[PDB]
Amino acid sequence: PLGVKGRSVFAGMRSFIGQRLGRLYDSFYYSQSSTKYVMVFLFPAGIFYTRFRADTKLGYHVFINEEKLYPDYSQNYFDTKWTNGRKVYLDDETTVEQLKAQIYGGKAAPENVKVACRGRVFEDADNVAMAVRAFCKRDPRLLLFQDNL
Amino acid sequence: STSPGLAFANLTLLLDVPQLPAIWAVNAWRELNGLFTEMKTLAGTSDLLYPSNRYNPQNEKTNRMGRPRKYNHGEWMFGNSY
Amino acid sequence: RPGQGSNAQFQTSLADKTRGLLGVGFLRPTKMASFAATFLLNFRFYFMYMARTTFQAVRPLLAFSVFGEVMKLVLATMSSGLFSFLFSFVLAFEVFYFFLQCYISYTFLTMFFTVLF
Amino acid sequence: VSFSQFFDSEYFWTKANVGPFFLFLFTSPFWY
Amino acid sequence: AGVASLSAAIALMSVGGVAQGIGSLFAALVSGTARNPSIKEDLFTYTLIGMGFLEFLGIICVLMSAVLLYS
Amino acid sequence: AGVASLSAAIALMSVGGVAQGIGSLFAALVSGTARNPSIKEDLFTYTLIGMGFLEFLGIICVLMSAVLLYS
Amino acid sequence: AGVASLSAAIALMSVGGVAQGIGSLFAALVSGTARNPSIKEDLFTYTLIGMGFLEFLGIICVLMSAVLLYS
Amino acid sequence: AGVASLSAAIALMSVGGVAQGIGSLFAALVSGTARNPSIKEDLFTYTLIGMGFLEFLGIICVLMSAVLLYS
Amino acid sequence: AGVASLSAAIALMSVGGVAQGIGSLFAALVSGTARNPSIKEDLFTYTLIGMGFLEFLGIICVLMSAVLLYS
Amino acid sequence: SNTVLSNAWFYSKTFPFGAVFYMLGSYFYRDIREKLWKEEKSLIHTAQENKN
Amino acid sequence: KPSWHVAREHRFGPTLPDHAYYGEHATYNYFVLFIRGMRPYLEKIFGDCASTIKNAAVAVYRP
Amino acid sequence: IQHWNKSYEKQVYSESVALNRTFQARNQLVLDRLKPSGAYRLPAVDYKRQLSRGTLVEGADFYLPTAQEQQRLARHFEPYSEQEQEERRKFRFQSISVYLAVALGASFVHDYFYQRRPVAWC
Amino acid sequence: QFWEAQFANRSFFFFGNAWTSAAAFAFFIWWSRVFDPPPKERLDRYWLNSPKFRILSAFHNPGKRPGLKISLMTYE
Amino acid sequence: LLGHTTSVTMGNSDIFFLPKPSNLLKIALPAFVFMPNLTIFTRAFPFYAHTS
Amino acid sequence: YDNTASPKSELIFMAGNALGYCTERFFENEYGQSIFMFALGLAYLAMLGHEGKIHGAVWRMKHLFATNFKMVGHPRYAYALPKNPLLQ
Amino acid sequence: KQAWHSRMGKFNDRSDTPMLYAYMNELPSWEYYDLHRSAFLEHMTYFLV
């Protein structure tokens, strides 16, 4: 005897979802504290953050011409030193000035510093996204150099 | 249960089935951004919007590549220069 | 009451109940970190297993292809009849070796694709 | 046939023809 | 193109190091067949498994020799 | 850097001791299967545990080799 | 600058002895088990202890190698 | 340039023989346990004395390595 | 008269290990024959199977030696 | 009008494999057939005895 | 491995039941019982869909 | 030494008292409020407890849903009805014609609708 | 047979070692995208340098030389 | 014809047909396991998948 | 320029990048069509082996049941049979 | 039946080759009382009284 009169398939769906959620709560309660919190919140959260950032935002590999132009990262922890090739995720509204400030930590940058991509110098009042789209399509490797000339 | 020959599938599952929530969230975010863009277009714009483009900086004072518009200081009899 | 004698002993401090609310000796974030570390370190077994699997899958391909190329070099280089007569037996040995490797691969694959449940 | 008496469990699982409904349900992405 | 040849020749040592071990495996098979001739199979399976392991090591080192000889 | 190509070979030379060890292990396994066959299910298990170590060590001897071939 | 890689490879060219020792360990385990199964729990109990030293030595045999690759 | 690193790596090579000796020790231990469990507790004592020499020599080796990687 | 000769000579160091393996093979054959002659045709068979690897490996090394002598 | 019968593939795989199969079949012609027909013979014997 | 001493972390008894650890029955398990129970609804669904498709194809093919 | 190890044990169990007090508080605050009802409990019993109860059954990886299918080997006289017999007589062999038709159709569709690729034109 | 296999144990859709499991795995990889053809954005990654592609182009252009059209297809 | 040359498509040519004579055979054959069983021990799968 | 590091969080894309590489290189082309045919051949061989098993089973059932006079059915269901009038 | 029992034992039991026994910090009742025989006695005398 499938189905009952006066009852709806949507009511049965609600029944089933309630059962499933109660069972999930029971199984989460009767589980190890050492493992369950990690496996249920911290790995899912990190994977979600990483995948969303990669699949949604757009990032750039940054290089610097000279070691004297490297930023000072001695004080901030977990990164005592600059390394070239760092992947950097930015927003579409970011400008070259904002990128430079982000690199140099909101501190005094060197003089006549400019950004290039595939040999092509960017203006400082330029959107990084559109400048890369124009000059280096699908090769976002940026370089920071000193323009004395 | 499992076996060494299923290491490919085990790794693939463990690394990919947690990403499916993120994939669906990305798809939903994209659909919503498209919806908002189309609602904006229906409302009206000075310069057009490219729907399937990453970024649309164009306005009265800005090109479709983020630069300032040339010859945009004065006014023109036919209206906008675009 | 039956259990009032035992439930009278259960009276706690403010600091006691704060510590219990926070779960000091019962959450063990160091244990959680150790679990995460061990779990991530256990990913080497997948690499080991896939390495073994690919070797057992390509063993017949190697025996059929690269030793074949060597035999082909020798065939291309040899001209006389005596050396060819002696090389026929090497070729037959390669046949038997290929079948041996195929049997071995069958064995390792039925070992690696046998599941209890 | 009414929405209610169609989606009633007995009629849905005994007398109704749910083939078109479930085919529409499967092909929902195509229509979208 | 001189360091590659020496690299391959030095990598070829594991072949000789591996031939020992195959010798011991088949010696053990022989001794087991001599001590219990009623069990020939179930000794050749383990012998072939160990041969496969040591053959895999040999293939590894020979592959890396051929690699380093041209790369 | 040709010595890189040498280093990898040297990192593979340990395989000569590895395969030998593996051989000895399986030799003992065969001897056991020739002495007390009715407990193969034990001996093979222990052998697998041993390989679970030896394999890993050999894999290191490969990996570091390749690393010294690239870095 | 490949001398660091050479030093790392040389320091890594001692895992063969660890592997031979582990093979002898598990070979004796299997032999003494086929000789007396009822006492397996002890042969294993000591076997793990031996690994508790050998693997540690191997760990050094890796670690110092890695250090010699960078420092 | 790589004098200290090369000398440390060349010094670190005896760990293979050390591990082989430890493996022989514990192989004899498990074998003697299989052959006479009633004196198991005695055998392990001597085995530990063996370690008391072997590991000691190994320690000296590593100390010399630490001395030579920094001159 | 350069590095090719050195590499083709260094490749030949594996022949010692191959010879030790062959010696182990035929020593096991001899022991099994002296123990149970009535399975000679079996043991000889297995011995040939072992040679079917060991000899082949040696030939491999010899060929690669010539390949390093005329690369 | 081809090089199939003068090929390295021919001389390496076709003739060796075929000649080995032929030699093995010629040498073990009767052992194989007997080992195969053992089961059928036993079944027919059992069936006939049961019938009788 | 059994012992008469209890460590600190294991001082306060079992907090978990047995089914929290042990695997379910091998042959009568949760999913297989579930799908055996859901067999009739799935049979209804796919039979209806197949009959609809077959009737459409026949209505096209006969004329 | 006696002094010191005795007092060591003393504040060992002091720490134990502290642990027990916080354990009680944790339980009676959080877990007695968050405890599940038992309606959605696990609908099974472990195989060890079943084995001790004398309840465990191991067999029949498969099953027979319908009684018509269950009682076939016990009826001995009508394992299959007559209608069922004539329906079964239609499947004495597999249908190579249907195999051929379906395989050709699926290959045609897969090749000329799903696996189209571009080609150059001169 | 397939239907009954789905409700048999260790015989669900692509799980197990049965022929039904193999067939379901084949249908699964077919339904997936990995074996679908590439888009036009990704043709010069493999397809325009493929022996199958070149042979088919040469066959359907009998007496001609499609190297130039292949270059132009890459450009496109 | 700049953008219309990648639109000239040609279909594949593979036919998926093979007769399946089982009357010739009387023995079973081995079969691969393609994926792990997640319908059993689902909760423990990340925890036991690395073992053997 | 080729020292393009990337965050260590993106190691979870190892298998995804691997499968994408093998798709772009093998699966979405003629070698991928060969692989699909290979999978179909695996299915074909599994089906053949299953039917061969059934063939062998029935071929033995014939010889061992059809001439017994003692197996009118299976012995596990003999309770359901009628009773012998000759036994008493 | 024997295969069933051996499979389940190999899967669930605490052994030198453990499949399911892994990442164990909070034990279940059976394993807890099998490892800590002192507590089974204490927990059992309390229950009966």
From TrEMBL, chain B:
Signal peptide extent: 1-25
Domain of life: Eukaryota
Record keywords: Signal
Protein name: Transmembrane protein
Residues represented out of the complete protein: 2 to 76 of 92
UniProtKB/TrEMBL annotation, chains E, F, G, H, I:
Any one GO MF annotation of this record: lipid binding
Keyword Transport recorded: yes
Domain of life, per lineage: Eukaryota
Compartment(s) of residence: Membrane
Keywords assigned: CF(0), Hydrogen ion transport, Ion transport, Lipid-binding, Membrane, Transmembrane, Transmembrane helix, Transport
GO biological-process terms attached to the record: proton motive force-driven ATP synthesis
Chief location of this protein within or outside the cell: membrane
Domain (V-ATPase proteolipid subunit C-like) ranges: 6-67
Record-stated family: Belongs to the ATPase C chain family.
Identification of the protein by name: Putative ATP synthase F0 subunit 9
Source organism of this protein record: Toxoplasma gondii (strain ATCC 50853 / GT1)
Automatic annotation (TrEMBL), chain L:
Any one Gene Ontology cellular component term annotated for this protein: mitochondrial inner membrane
Main localization of the protein described in the UniProt heading: mitochondrion
Keyword field contains Cell membrane: no
Protein name: Cytochrome c1, heme protein
Family: Belongs to the cytochrome c family.
Keywords noted in UniProt: Electron transport, Heme, Iron, Membrane, Metal-binding, Mitochondrion, Mitochondrion inner membrane, Respiratory chain, Transmembrane, Transmembrane helix, Transport
GO BP terms in the entry: mitochondrial electron transport, ubiquinol to cytochrome c
Compartment(s): Mitochondrion inner membrane
GO molecular function: electron transfer activity; heme binding; metal ion binding
Whole sequence portion shown: 33 to 154 of 398
Coiled coil regions in record: none
From TrEMBL, chain P:
Domain of life: Eukaryota
UniProt-recorded name of the protein: Uncharacterized protein
Organism encoding this protein: Toxoplasma gondii (strain ATCC 50853 / GT1)
Whole sequence portion shown: 329 to 377 of 669
